Symmetry: C3
Subunit: 100 residues, 3 copies
Amino acid sequence: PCLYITTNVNFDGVNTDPFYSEVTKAVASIVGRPQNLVMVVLKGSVEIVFGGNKEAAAYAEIVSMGGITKQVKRELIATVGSILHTHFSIHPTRFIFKVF
Amino acid sequence: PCLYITTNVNFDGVNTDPFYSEVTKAVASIVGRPQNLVMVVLKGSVEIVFGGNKEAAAYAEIVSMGGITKQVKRELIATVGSILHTHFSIHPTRFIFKVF
Amino acid sequence: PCLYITTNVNFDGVNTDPFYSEVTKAVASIVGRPQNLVMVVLKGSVEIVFGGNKEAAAYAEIVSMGGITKQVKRELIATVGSILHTHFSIHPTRFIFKVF
């Protein structure tokens, strides 16, 4: 599974490894795959507009080589949204997550 | 709905707010959603090759949380392509738009 | 067809035209379209984590305006993965390729 994240947050001088560690373990647990086979692509400093302003926001897509369930989708959106919120102060209300 | 745009145009020192204002109102009107719930992700300065050259070009994807129609797809491609053309001189012949 | 490539490889001071030339001809031959109608979007210097490390890696998506076959998908993954390997030393084991 590949989690591709695009956000307007600037990661200059930010240690993103605490995030990668938590997200990769969390996604791996949710989808039921080994943590080493979760690819994370994190692209910051991309201009975003949402809600009529440029507050911290993110768009993410996850591509899983296999079907999933409604509950797995709910858990992914909730968990990734929380981890993004906890680490980068992207509020879940400004997080759009396509689950492919 | 999230409109994710990737282009080789350089937005250094460019006021993109006139574009965000027109595109968000236009997309909102076409898909029938409030303008504040249209996310726009605009990533410039990405190398693109098309038609054998590197002239101004763009790839875009729109993710709508609901079905649409053939006419809505036509209107989105025509309208977004025009707004990109008008504001950033990306010619619609060099605009590839995936409507998810 | 549009081939959108995201990688952690840094293309500063790299001539990417040898790559564009080979990939566009190879994709065009595989999918059966003129080489001038293959768009390539190559975005480097994007942080990626896979296999628990940040070695050279890439995520790619190809959007074809028409159906394809299992064999065409196999040929695209094998061929693009090889060209990325040959030119940018991205090993195919660290190449995730979504064929839409």
